[PDB]
C-alpha cells in the first residue's frame, strides 16, 4: 500500500545515483535475509534512504 509507494519512489531516485545491478544485488541480499516479508521492504527503504542522504552530503555530480 503506502509502504510500496514509498519504496517505488526510493527505487526511482536511487537508480539515478547508483548502478542498477548494484542496487539489484543489494535487493537480493535483503531477500536472502528477510524472504518476502514486509520487514525486507522496511529494511531496504531505510537503507536506500540512508545511501541517498550520504550520497547527497558527499556531493551528487549527477
Amino acid at each position: 500500500e503506502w509502504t510500496l509507494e514509498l519504496l517505488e519512489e526510493l527505487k526511482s531516485e536511487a537508480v539515478r545515483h547508483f548502478p542498477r545491478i548494484w542496487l539489484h544485488n543489494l535487493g537480493q541480499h535483503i531477500y536472502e535475509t528477510y524472504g518476502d516479508t514486509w520487514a525486507g521492504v522496511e529494511a531496504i527503504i531505510r537503507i536506500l534512504q540512508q545511501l541517498l542522504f550520504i550520497h547527497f552530503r558527499i556531493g551528487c555530480s549527477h
Binding site: L7, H24, Y31
Partner: peptide, 6 residues
Amino acid sequence: NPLEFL
C-alpha cells in the same frame, strides 16, 4: 518484485 531493480 519490490526488491528487484532489473
